[PDB]
Ligand binder design. Structure first.
Ligand SMILES: CCCCCCCC/C=C\CCCCCCCC(=O)OC[C@H](O)CO
Ligand SMILES: CCCCCCCC/C=C\CCCCCCCC(=O)OC[C@H](O)CO
Ligand SMILES: CCCCCCCC/C=C\CCCCCCCC(=O)OC[C@H](O)CO
Ligand SMILES: CCCCCCCC/C=C\CCCCCCCC(=O)OC[C@H](O)CO
Ligand SMILES: CCCCCCCC/C=C\CCCCCCCC(=O)OC[C@H](O)CO
Ligand SMILES: CCCCCCCC/C=C\CCCCCCCC(=O)OC[C@H](O)CO
Ligand SMILES: CCCCCCCC/C=C\CCCCCCCC(=O)OC[C@H](O)CO
Ligand SMILES: CCCCCCCC/C=C\CCCCCCCC(=O)OC[C@H](O)CO
Ligand SMILES: [Mn+2]
Ligand SMILES: [Mn+2]
Length: 398
């Protein structure tokens, strides 16, 4: 037990490598080269602070975020919070589900429907682990993170990127209205609200404590786990950018956000082996982030309302929007706009209570978050909310 909270940290980090980030990072590389690497880095650092504040809420108060809302806020407001939190968990799981089904299509050739059934069944077995023991799930998610990191490591060696061109991409410079829009879309759609509630419960009561000094030691050993777990997610997101830029930018490639076109152009440029590592890495990202999304939903309802439904019933409900899109044949860009609108709704409603309760001695006791870290959480919050509000102005304006 050298790293006590490494499990919850790896569980929370997988939501920031979901297939939603694959489509964004690839599109940024082909259209603008490496010149967007600074945006990927900026979004990852902001996601480390928010996820660290959730884990501390559970360690200090001995209670998770949905529990404290039920206990302190009025019943009319609590019922609304449970409602919107379920809708966001279903919105973010849609992209994690469809991505896991697309990777199977690139590796085997199966249609999107049968790919979704394969991912639906394997996600059962992942949450089947955490039923009796929560540690087997922490080992499984960690194993999937090992494959995505190794797969994109070989793609960098094969792509042979110009280091001088990669370095110039970390300079915050943007040209043309297209590149600016794509950067705003990264920072606006990065933080995962469903994993904000979940991280608090995973660390809540993980180590029994009778004093306040042993809880404080748990906070220090937890931060290293979050930084290491969230840090690895950032380097992976930058690898997707570099490979797409080192191969597609100078060759005039259109429709880069679609993971199918990016998969086909890797063979004549890099080779057939470069395409396999891409799809294998996309598969481990999808089903891992989908199984975490279900465990978050169970915590949301159990804390907000006191009762809970079985896990198999929760997995069944969240799969419903996934199969509907497959049957209707919706545009991949159309589903990323509607799902992010709901994600743009859940972000403000999640960051506000997290920044309030982690700052109240009534909740945290002698482990209140430093006010210097509370203001920066609000500054990061206003930046994200404003960008989301702007993204809603064009998404709801047409
Ligand atoms: C590692 C896991 C399986 C081996 C990967 C090899 C099996 C699939 C690799 C070849 C591939 O991905 O292309 C298949 C084709 O595109 C279909 O339409
Ligand atoms: C990845 C989840 C499994 C952990 C590593 C596998 C080694 C077996 C572990 C415990 C013995 C229980 C054996 C039966 C396995 C039931 C839990 C799955
Ligand atoms: C290849 C298609 C599958 C998609 C996921 C890619 C690999 C994910 C990593 C480990 C999976 C299980 C290994 C568990 C760790 C070793 C246990 C013995
Ligand atoms: C900018 C508006 C957000 C300002 C925070 C509102 C607030 O209530 O501050 C939290 C404080 O810790 C307790 O009241
Ligand atoms: C000292 C930390 C205060 C941070 C300065 C910003 C506090 C403004 C604010 O709204 O906080 C309301 C609270 O009641 C009062 O700090
Ligand atoms: C960007 C500024 C983020 C840092 C803001 C530093 C000022 C924080 C503040 O106003 O109150 C903190 C208090 O003085 C001590 O914890
Ligand atoms: C753009 C910036 C918006 C204001 C962001 C900071 C406003 C909210 C921070 C004040 C706060 O709530 O933290 C201090 C707390 O009230 C006691 O220390
Ligand atoms: C009160 C609402 C805020 C006012 C507007 C928000 C600031 C600019 C945002 C979008 C403008 C179009 C994209 C930026 C182009 C500005 C230069 C032309
Ligand atoms: Mn994500
Ligand atoms: Mn160029």
């Amino acid at each position: 037990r050298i790293l006590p909270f490494l499990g919850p940290a790896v569980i929370a980090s997988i939501a920031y490598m979901d297939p939603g980030n694959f489509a964004t990072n690839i599109e940024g590389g082909a259209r603008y080269g490496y010149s967007l690497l600074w945006v990927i880095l900026a979004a990852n650092l902001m996601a480390m602070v928010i996820q660290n504040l959730s884990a501390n809420l559970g360690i200090a108060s001995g209670r998770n975020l949905p529990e404290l809302i039920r206990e302190r806020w009025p019943r009319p407001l609590v019922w609304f919070y449970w409602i919107q939190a379920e809708l966001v968990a279903m919105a973010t799981d849609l992209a994690e589900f469809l991505g896991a089904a697309l990777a199977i299509q690139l590796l085997t050739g199966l249609p999107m429907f049968w790919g979704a059934v394969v991912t639906g069944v394997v996600t059962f077995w992942l949450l089947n682990l955490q039923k009796r023991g929560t540690r087997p799930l922490e080992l499984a998610v960690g194993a999937f993170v090992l494959m995505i990191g190794v797969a994109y490591l070989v793609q960098v060696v094969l792509a042979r990127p110009d280091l001088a061109a990669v370095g110039a991409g970390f300079v915050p410079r943007l040209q043309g209205p297209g590149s600016a829009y794509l950067a705003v879309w990264i920072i606006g759609a990065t933080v995962m609200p469903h994993v904000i509630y979940l991280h608090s419960a995973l660390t809540q009561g993980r180590i029994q404590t009778d004093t306040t000094e042993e809880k404080r030691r748990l906070v220090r050993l937890n931060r290293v786990d979050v930084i290491a777990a969230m840090g690895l997610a950032g380097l992976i997101n930058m690898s997707m950018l570099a490979v797409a830029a080192a191969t597609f930018h100078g060759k005039n490639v259109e429709n880069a956000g679609d993971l199918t076109t990016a998969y086909q152009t890797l063979t004549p440029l890099l080779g057939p082996a470069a395409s396999v590592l891409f799809a294998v890495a996309l598969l481990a990202s999808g089903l891992s982030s989908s199984a975490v999304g279900t465990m978050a939903g169970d915590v949301i309802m159990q804390g907000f309302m006191g009762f809970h439904i079985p896990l198999w019933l929760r997995r069944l409900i969240t799969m419903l929007p996934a199969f509907i899109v497959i049957l209707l044949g919706m545009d991949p860009s159309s589903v990323l706009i509607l799902s992010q609108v709901i994600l743009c709704f859940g972000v403000p409603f999640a960051l506000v209570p997290l920044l309030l309760f982690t700052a109240r001695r009534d909740v945290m006791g002698a482990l209140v978050t430093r006010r210097s870290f509370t203001v920066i959480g609000w500054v990061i919050a206003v930046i994200i909310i404003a960008l989301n509000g702007y993204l809603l102005w064009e998404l709801l304006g047409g």
